[PDB]
Structure formats: structure tokens, C-alpha cells
Symmetry: C3
Subunit: 341 residues, 3 copies
């Protein structure tokens, strides 16, 4: 498959890991993810060096992952620390590949490429997720589509007007204002819906509304497939700087060429201590992302064979600039690698 | 896959369609089938021109199918009639492919191939389905086998449907049409059929013919009559047995019964609307799907079928389909 | 796929066959297996010569297998003996392929390759299965892995230490002494676990014993994938021969390139008339082979694509000599055949 391996990808949410290993495939690479006794997260190739058994099916012994087949034990670095057979020798050939991993902003980031090049400073900024001023809730979802389809989906938040009709439709959609900002390793799609009636969702954020209001749906894309949106609503002429909002985490990580992992979240500055508001945001993520965006994109993935078999290319609309620019940047990154090594 | 695209195929029964689009694949082509406000059926490629979303998952807006993803709207011709974005321009690139479709004889016919060759006059004749003198009931069925296996099944020397349990032979070959005739004077095993028996009494003649039309549309004739009456004045049923390829290894099966007896009798409708009693008994379904699973082995090896005396009709039909395949493939 | 067709493989256990045909695929070849009225087992290609229907879905008529589609009937030799259509002629083109089959040692052996080379004298010896001095119980299992993975598994009974720890664990495993015997078309791995307490299984063998014991785990491999192990346990310094033992039948037969049939059994010389002793062996078989072993190897099979895509080769340990020798012999046999056609 075609992937951009030299970049950080989210492999899991902190709460998904423990002393019991989690087996998950990232960029066609099977991984064994677990948290060691000292709390440090480890990510090993889920293939024992001996006979290829799944290390993820083993248990921790003295904080070391024990292969369930013949008992070899490994440390977080992939180093074999115990061989219960024969002279118990541990030659270098018994070490397993260990991947660079960094736990930051309540996310487990992994570098699937040359471990020597992993640069922590290149990890996208999702600080809001651990900011005490924000309330964050979210989850995980699996989708049977190429990750680029979801990136396209998120880079044109205008699809909410239809796919999420019941919760996001606005009567001022025809008055939308959009801008695209290209930076270094970052692209932004700004959108503002002026003087309209709050959508059913924004209304909930406002705990009941009717009077006109201004709403924004901006989104920031960072190298490969990590996005953070900005959904905000505020009366008439109230600047978005001081508006209530939700900074949404929308990060995709390729599983196989035709499937991907979707990590989503909401970091809001309103109704912080409201379990009901928590419910509103969780219901939306469940219906919108997992049970609406999934259907559209999975159906699109099923039609790929037909479109490719024939010479069908997509027809872009005025709302596609951002998505197209991001698509082109990912394509360039793919070409570089396919061309580098 | 190998399909004969230049021909009319049944895509659905009238009752299956409404203002709520039906998504169905025909010859590996996904279609969005729906009936417009004026009652006219439309068939569009189920792939939005914008980003390929399934139009069949959308709803009608002002009689126009609205894509569920970003709202583009299309008319029955595939023409984009509304773009809610930006200047709302509608360049030709936003139109979606529309397929020739004709509703006739209580069937929805579609032409999946070269649209320039789509000629309504070439649509097989199933007039009995809408003939007030006949009572028609039927349904739809899905099978996991290549459509040719079911065509072979139906063309097989008068094996009839379970419900039809019971001069001589004659196989007339025409242009895109083949007829397999069978008259059974007096007969031995049994001439009067379980379902027809209730009619008349005195000695009779029996008939079991089937007509095949270009590709995979068949209409059979199951009948019985006393002494030696006219074939057309007999107690009979004309069965609709039409296959439409879905993928190379699966197909749609549209079946029906047009009978001239017990017209206003509901007991008979129920059994004639049964898939296993009228189209394929479970035992036979297990067999064609099992045959499809053995295709790889037979092809990998040089295994060819050994024909028996009962295969003439099936073989002739198979050869005609093969010729049609070659014609199309030859072009490109 | 790559198979060694010129050799005898077990296609079924005697008890699995009757007048009701069994459809099973061996080396990617679908077969119809059944026992005729006179008790003789027949194996026909499960593809009717007429239109390819599954003969295995038919019934016997006058001892002849009747195709469920149009009624052609065949004898054990594959010869069409009845055509109910037209003049009822039976040309040679209506005969179906019949495979060499031999019922011996309570096993149904079939020859899937060149029929002119099938030699009954080449059938592996599993006489213990029909020896009145032994009590035999066993069964069948289907596994989604290449048969070679299970051959590797069995040629290193040491995995029992971890994969079956709850029932096979042993402390003396560290003082293990193993031998490797090579013979004409035969390889044996010897294992001796002297001085120590018996595992949960051995204790049941000795009907709850309370004495340090000497254990024995040997296994014999014969051409391709037929194995017979020797699990024994006896009061310390006791003649290994005169020990309480169970000769285990462990025979694999490839189904497809990534799946296989597993025939297992236990021929014991202790507790012959004990339905409960029968119960301990049956429970172990259910938990250890069909469950535990299955899980490990099916996971390994799923990782084959990754290991092949990359240049990953297995790292052998001191416990792999036997398995490696057997693997090399099978590879040679594969090369020979591929070298001919
Ligand atoms: S496969 Fe892991 S120790 Fe053998
Ligand atoms: S995919 Fe249909 S309007 Fe976008
Ligand atoms: S397929 Fe076996 S008799 Fe016709
Ligand atoms: Fe969405
Ligand atoms: Fe085992």
C-alpha cells in the first residue's frame, strides 16, 4: 500500500492501554501496545523474533512482555531479556523491533518509520485536550475506508449541512463565508455562518436559543492526517475570540489500504461540569462520526473499484479548495517516499 | 467480469420502487432506482459526480434525487439541476450517468451497455403479465451463483417448478430467441399437474414449453387440456423467469406466474408467490451455489462438462450467449 | 498453491464416514468420501462430470453415489453406472475421478497425486491405534493455518510449557535433555524431564500420584505431515519402556494453502476401561489442540503477509533442531515435485 511512514500517528487513546497488551495494526504494521509497571507505554512489532507468534496475546512478567508461545521475554525497548531455553543465551537476533512512542495531550503517538528520525518536536499540537480550562470527552471508531476519504470529509465541514442534517442544518448556509490559509506543514479551512438561527446542536450548546447568532466551523490540518476543528457560536456581533466553543480532535490513522482508525474528541470551554452536556457531545460523536460519516464514506470506498476500473475522476465544487490542497500535500508526501527509498 | 451489456435486463419489479431510492447492482454497475412524482421510473449510476457518494441513500427534493453528502440534485436524466455551493454553477461535469429504462409488462427493464444501441423494440415480450385475462403473482430472489447456471436450470428438459410437479420435443432457434417445445399426449408418469388437476377430468394432453430471449429472460408455458383441444384454449400458466447478473458470481432472479385459471382464488396466490415453490427449491439452490464454488478447480484443471441427452436446449442457449459476449468483446 | 501431491495423507477417521457422503477438501481438491454397503470406503472427486454439482450432497442408491442434480450414479471406481436420461448411454466421459484410498490403522489414507505411484507399503505405521492392548480415543479439528505451522508446533513439544501451562507446566523443564534421531524418511525428537513433580496431566495419568517422576515427550515424524508422539510418566528411576504411556496420533492434512485438517488421537496402555480416563484425554485434546494450539498458529498465519512482505526470517532456538530438520525435508520434497511438472 501507499503510506507516509515518516510522521507521527495516533495509535491509541491512553485509556485503551494497560498491562494487558492491545494488538492493533497501523500502516499495515501489527503492533503490541502496553503500559509498563512504571507507567511508560511501549510499542513493539507484534511478531515474536523466534517463530512470529503474537506478543500481544502474551502477559507481562516482571514488567516484561512474555511471548505466549515459547516464553521469550522483552523489555520496552524490544530487547530480549530472558530466554528460558538451553543455555538461555540471548543473541541480538532475538530482539524485536520497538517503535518510537510519545504520550502527550492524552494521546499515544507512534512513529512507524526510521526510529532514528523520530522528532518529538514534530508532534502536532493538541494542548487543549489537557488544558484544565477545557472539558474533554471522546472515543475511538473503526472504519472500512481509506483514511483519505475521512480527511476529505473533515476538510469540508460543509457536508454537515446534509449528512448531519438533523443536528447541524442552518438556515444561513447560503450566506457562508470561507477562506483557506496555507502555512508550513499546516492548512486551515475557515468558515463562518453569519446571522442565522442556531442549529439544533449549537442551540444545545446555548441551552436553548432562537435569536440570531454567528457560528464558525474552522479546521486545522497538520502533516498527514491529524485535524483539530473549531466549532463556535455567539450572538450577532460577538467576536469568535470570546465565543463559547468546542475544539474537536479528529485524527485518522491508516490500518490497511482500505481501513482506518478514527480518534475523535471534543474540548469545550462551556458547561465544563455538566454530565448532560457531556451526553450531548457523546451522542453527536456516536451519531455523526460513527453512525453517519461512516456510512457515507464506507459506501464510497465500496465504489472505488468501479471508479478506478472506469476513468472516473471527482468533480470539485466551490467548497473543496481546502480538501484539495490537503489531498495534494499528502500525494506529494507519498511520491517522495515511493521515490526516496 | 464477462457480461453481455448490450441487451435489456430486468432491474426490478414495479412494486419494489417508490420515491425512496433502491440501490441495486446490475452487471457490476451500482444503480439508484426510483419513481419520480409523475410516476416515471429513473435509473442513475449510484455514484455522485462530486465525491462518489451513494445517491440511492438520498431523498427526493421537488422530484429530484438529492445526494446525501453535499446536496447536489439531479433529474431523471442525470442532469444536475441544483448546486447549493458558491455561485451555484452547474457545469456539464456535474451530470451523472442515466440509464435507458422502460417499464413494460409489470417489469422494470434497463439497458446497461452502449446507450446508442438501446432500442425499446428489442425488449422481450411478456405481455401476459399485464393481460386482464391472466392473474399474475411473483417475486424476487437473490442467488450466489453465475446467472448462466440458472439459465441452464430453466432450459433443462422440462423440469418445471415444484408447484408444477407432474408431437414430442422441438427446439426452434431464432435470432436472439430460442424455443424449447414439449407436447405430452396422454403421458405416462402423469400429465395433469397437481396444481392444474382440479380442472376438467377426462383424458388430456399436456404441454411444457419455454421461450428464451437474448441473454437471460425466459417465459415458459405449462398446460393441460382434454382430448386434443387447441394449445391456446387449454388450462395454463405462463411463468416469468428472468435472471440479471449482479456480479460474476451472483445474480438477481425475478419470477412470476401468469395463469388463466382460478383467477380470483387467493389460496393459489400464496404458493405461486413462493420462491422455493416457484423458482428454486432450497436443495437446488445449495447445488448451483456449490457449483459456483467449484469453478476455480474446474478452470484450474482442464475440466469441461459432459453433455447428456437432456442438454440440447441449454447448450444452444449457452452458445448464443457466448456469441453475444464475443461480439461485444470483439469491438473494444 | 504448493503441495506435495505424491504421498499418502489422512483424509478422515473411520468413524467420520458412512453411507452419508462427507465432503472434504484435501490439497485444494474437493472429495466425496463414503463407505459402500460392503464396507469399502470410496473417495471420488466432488465434482459431477455432467454439470459439476457436489456428489457429496447426494445419497447412495443400490450402493452407488447418486448426483443430487440430475441423477447420474457412480460406483466406487468413479465409473458412471446409470444415466436416467435419453437412451441412457454411459460414455467414458461420464466417469468421475476416483482416488486411491486405503483404510489401515483406524485411518483413511488417500493418495492425491499421480495414481501410478501410489504404494500401500509406504503408508506410515500407526498400528497402536488398532492394538487390543491399547485404548484409543480421538477426533477431528479444522485450523485456519498452513499445515507446516502445526508440524513445527508438534516437532517442538516444548511449547506445551507455555501454550498449555495450566496443564503441562513442569519445573524440571530447565533440566530438560533432548535428542534428535534421523532416519530414512523419519525424524524423531526425544525429550526427557527427569526428577521432579509431574504436571497436571501426568498426575492424572498416575491417578493422582505423590512421587517425584521422570517424564518423556518423544515424537516421530514421517514423510510430509504424519506424527506419532510418546508421552510417558513413571516413578523416577524406572525403565522408560515399562512406563505408563500414551502414543499420540497427530496427523495434518493440508486443505488449502492457508488451512488444514488436524486428526488427533491417544492410544494409551493404562486405564483402558476407564470412561473417566477417556474423559481426561478428551478434555486435554479439546483444550490443548483444538483451542490453545489453534489460537497461536492461526495468529501466526495472519502475520505471514507482513513477514514475507518484509524480509523477516525466523530466529531458531536450541529447541528447534527437530522442527528445522523436518521443515527442510518437506521443502526438499516440494522442490522435487515442482522440479518435475
Ligand atoms: S514464537 Fe515467541 S518464543 Fe517462540
Ligand atoms: S458526493 Fe454528492 S454532492 Fe458531494
Ligand atoms: S450435475 Fe450431476 S447429473 Fe447433472
Ligand atoms: Fe461529519
Ligand atoms: Fe500443543
Amino acid at each position: 500500500a501507499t503510506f507516509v511512514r515518516n510522521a507521527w500517528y495516533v495509535a491509541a487513546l491512553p485509556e485503551e492501554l494497560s498491562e494487558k497488551p492491545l494488538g492493533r495494526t497501523i500502516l499495515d504494521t501489527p503492533l503490541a501496545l502496553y503500559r509498563q509497571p512504571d507507567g511508560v507505554v511501549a510499542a513493539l512489532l507484534d511478531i515474536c523474533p523466534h517463530r512470529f507468534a503474537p506478543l500481544s496475546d502474551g502477559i507481562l512478567v516482571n514488567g516484561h512482555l512474555q511471548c505466549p508461545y515459547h516464553g521469550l521475554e522483552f523489555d520496552g525497548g524490544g530487547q530480549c531479556v530472558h530466554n528460558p531455553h538451553g543455555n538461555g543465551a540471548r543473541p541480538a537476533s532475538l530482539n524485536v523491533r520497538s517503535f518510537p512512542v510519545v504520550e502527550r495531550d492524552a494521546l499515544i503517538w507512534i512513529w512507524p518509520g526510521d526510529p532514528a528520525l523520530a522528532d518529538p518536536g514534530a508532534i502536532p499540537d493538541f494542548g487543549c485536550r489537557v488544558d484544565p480550562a477545557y472539558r474533554t470527552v471522546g472515543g475511538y471508531g473503526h472504519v472500512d475506508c481509506n483514511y483519505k476519504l475521512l480527511v476529505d470529509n473533515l476538510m469540508d465541514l460543509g457536508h454537515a449541512q446534509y449528512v448531519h442534517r438533523a443536528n447541524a442544518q442552518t438556515d444561513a448556509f447560503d450566506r457562508l463565508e470561507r477562506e483557506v490559509i496555507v502555512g508550513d506543514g499546516e492548512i486551515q479551512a475557515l468558515m463562518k455562518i453569519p446571522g442565522g438561527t442556531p442549529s439544533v446542536l449549537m442551540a444545545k450548546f446555548l441551552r436553548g436559543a432562537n435569536t440570531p447568532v454567528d457560528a464558525w466551523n474552522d479546521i486545522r490540518w497538520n502533516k498527514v492526517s491529524a485535524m483539530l476543528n473549531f466549532i463556535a457560536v455567539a450572538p450577532e456581533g460577538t467576536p469568535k475570540e470570546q465565543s463559547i466553543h468546542s475544539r474537536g480532535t479528529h485524527i485518522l490513522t491508516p490500518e490497511t489500504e482500505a481501513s482506518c482508525h478514527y480518534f475523535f474528541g471534543s474540548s469545550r470551554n462551556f458547561g465544563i461540569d455538566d454530565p448532560e452536556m457531556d451526553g450531548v457531545l457523546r451522542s453527536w460523536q456516536a451519531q455523526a462520526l460513527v453512525k453517519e460519516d461512516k456510512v457515507v464514506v464506507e459506501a464510497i470506498e465500496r465504489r472505488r473499484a468501479y471508479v478506478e476500473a472506469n476513468g472516473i475522476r471527482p468533480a470539485m465544487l466551490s467548497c473543496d479548495e481546502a480538501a484539495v490542497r490537503v489531498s495534494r500535500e499528502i500525494e506529494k508526501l507519498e511520491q517522495l517516499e515511493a521515490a526516496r527509498l
